[PDB]
């Protein structure tokens, strides 16, 4: 075999045991283990683990402080070189150069793999988890000191590179497409007339597009640190999960806007135009794989004020009800169909984050932080692998960008949307419901009539794109 360093001069040489490391039942998968053992596997020398580094760097903060994580990998990096074999000694003692057969093998199979993987952890740590350094200046100096004193011509390539990445991170993403984006569609409102922009005056195709761009961005901005430790459900949610919340609020605001648009259009016929146009937007959303968008409409249609408007939905064409039903069925039975759908589309897409939040939360508090074996309290790594499996999935859908041209004025119209105004959730919500009672009263009270409110034609230009440019 190949002799490892002495466990008395290198802690990461201590043998595995049912007391410091548990394997799951074709690389090994760690179920539980000590911080020391966990870090040994994070940089093992036998095999590669595509997810270990990300899983670890994403979740370690609950069971290990940053300052200690660094000390430990530096400790792991400092592998003591093995004493000469008997042959080496014999040669040296005769004034000859030792062959060093084992020493060379020990470097090729243990030292290099280990040291390279420790540097890989340093590189990723600095690259995608820099906040750790932004909150601990000393932590950064130690890293710089460490990376900057790694001697040897071997590691130089990488050491040199990490040093640069670190600096680049203190000082302060373009996209290439095969085909170019489709032409921006305009309806009644013309370019540069933000005073007229509105649900029925903007092209429905373009409303779905600009909102899909807007929503895709909000999705791509959520960081894992806003999800680990169920921090978006705690008192400091505003501080720890600002991107997540910003994204969830946009969804809510748009849902409420749709609801407001529907119920404030008192005239039956005009309201049917309003509802129909929104279902058309839903249709484009589905085409663009904007599942988040699809659900905002569904939620609007299923809210208390809109759901009960039977006289309106009765007059909705047969084809559109079917569209809205398929859409609604997505969420039915715990999002069974939705999950199937998302697993099968060809991104770019904008998933619905609610599913992920619920899974992360249940996983977080349905699994112990540690598992005990013979008294020892091992870190429950399987619980972390599960949370990182989710953050990983989320990140996979964050890579693909939409080939759509942004239209500034339309983006702004939707960013400054504020259905609620100065009202509080309850007040606004009740206002919407009363409006529902006013436009379509409860039985046996008969349905009244209201005067039209729009002066422009209500005919939709449709959702099939035009091809002139």
């Amino acid at each position: 075999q190949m002799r490892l360093p002495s466990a008395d001069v290198y802690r990461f040489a201590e043998p595995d045991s049912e007391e410091n490391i548990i394997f799951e039942e074709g690389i090994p998968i760690i179920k539980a283990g000590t911080v020391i053992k966990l870090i040994e596997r994070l940089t093992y020398h036998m095999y590669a683990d595509p997810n270990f580094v990300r899983t670890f760097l994403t979740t370690y903060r609950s069971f290990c402080k940053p300052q200690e994580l660094l000390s430990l990998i530096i400790e792991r990096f400092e592998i003591p070189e093995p004493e000469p074999t008997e042959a080496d000694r014999i040669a040296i003692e005769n004034g000859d150069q030792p062959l060093s057969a084992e020493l060379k093998r020990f470097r090729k199979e243990y030292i290099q793999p280990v040291q390279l993987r420790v540097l890989n952890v340093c590189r990723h740590w600095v690259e995608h988890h820099f906040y750790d350094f932004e909150r601990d200046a000393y932590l950064l100096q130690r890293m710089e000191e460490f990376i900057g004193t790694v001697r040897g011509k071997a590691m130089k390539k990488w050491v040199e590179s990490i040093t640069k990445i670190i600096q680049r991170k203190k000082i302060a993403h373009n996209i290439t497409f095969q085909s170019s984006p489709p032409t921006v569609e305009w309806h009644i409102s013309r370019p540069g007339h933000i005073e007229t922009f509105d649900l029925l005056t903007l092209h429905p195709i373009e409303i779905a597009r600009q909102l899909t761009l807007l929503e895709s961005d909000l999705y791509r901005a959520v960081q894992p640190s806003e999800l680990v430790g169920s921090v978006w459900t705690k008192e400091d949610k505003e501080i720890n999960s600002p991107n997540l919340l910003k994204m969830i609020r946009h969804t809510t605001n748009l849902t409420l806007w749709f609801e407001k648009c529907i119920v404030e259009t008192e005239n039956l016929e005009e309201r049917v135009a309003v509802v129909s146009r929104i279902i058309e937007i839903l249709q484009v959303f589905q085409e663009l794989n904007n599942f988040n968008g699809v659900l905002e409409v569904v939620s609007a249609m299923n809210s208390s004020p809109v759901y009960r408007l039977d006289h309106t939905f009765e007059q909705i064409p047969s084809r559109q009800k079917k569209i809205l039903e398929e859409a609604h069925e997505l969420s039915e039975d715990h999002y069974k169909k939705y999950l199937a759908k998302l697993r099968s589309i060809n991104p770019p897409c904008v998933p619905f984050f609610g599913i992920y939040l619920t899974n992360i939360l249940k996983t977080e508090e349905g699994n112990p932080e540690v598992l005990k074996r013979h008294g020892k309290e091992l870190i429950n790594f399987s619980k972390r692998r599960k949370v990182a499996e989710i953050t990983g999935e989320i990140q996979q859908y964050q890579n693909q960008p939409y080939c759509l041209r942004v239209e500034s004025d339309i983006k702004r119209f939707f960013e400054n949307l504020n259905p609620m105004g100065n009202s509080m959730e309850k007040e606004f919500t009740d206002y919407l419901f009363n409006k529902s009672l006013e436009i379509e009263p409860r039985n046996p009270k008969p349905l009244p009539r209201f005067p039209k409110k729009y002066s422009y034609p209500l005919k939709s230009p449709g959702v099939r794109p035009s091809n002139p440019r």
Binding site: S299, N302, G354, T358, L361, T363, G366, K386
Partner: protein
């Protein structure tokens, strides 16, 4: 057999998630993965009568306030939970109830008020308070400590009985 669609409502942080898990999961397995089908169904026997529980739980999705009505409409009975160490959550209950009455468009919707002990922090809502609130609504009151598996089954079965007797 009959299936009961039960909805667990309440402010974020009150432990709605732990309750659902404690009822559905296996208390004797090292690992739990809610990313596995039917971590919401459960076949149980209540008063000798067998039935299937379908827990519609959306913990973590509280901020998606405009999706609430949709999630609630499919429920047959509701668990209105609050934390005994959080007065806000307790004072919120009133609106959760009004919202349920609105989405189900009924005045008597089967429901149970649940006061949960999340941690070891100082209790700020006493039983009498909660008990009195429950009486005013004419619904049952059950205090649980999902963390110690106390009152959980009691809370859900009481709701199932509410639906039956309804």
């Amino acid at each position: 057999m009959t299936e009961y669609k039960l909805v667990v409502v309440g402010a974020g942080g009150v432990g709605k998630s732990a309750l659902t898990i404690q009822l559905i999961q296996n208390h004797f397995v090292d690992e739990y993965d809610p990313t596995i089908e039917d971590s919401y169904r459960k076949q149980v026997v209540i008063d000798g009568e067998t039935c299937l529980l379908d827990i519609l739980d959306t913990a973590g999705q509280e901020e998606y306030s405009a999706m609430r009505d949709q999630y609630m409409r499919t429920g047959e009975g509701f668990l209105c939970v609050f934390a005994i160490n959080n007065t806000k959550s307790f004072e919120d209950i009133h609106q959760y109830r009004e919202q349920i009455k609105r989405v189900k468009d009924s005045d008597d919707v089967p429901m149970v008020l649940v006061g949960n002990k999340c941690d070891l922090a100082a209790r700020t809502v006493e039983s009498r308070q909660a008990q009195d609130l429950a009486r005013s609504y004419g619904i049952p009151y059950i205090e649980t400590s999902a963390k110690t598996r106390q009152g959980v089954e009691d809370a859900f079965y009481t709701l199932v009985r509410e639906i039956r007797q309804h």
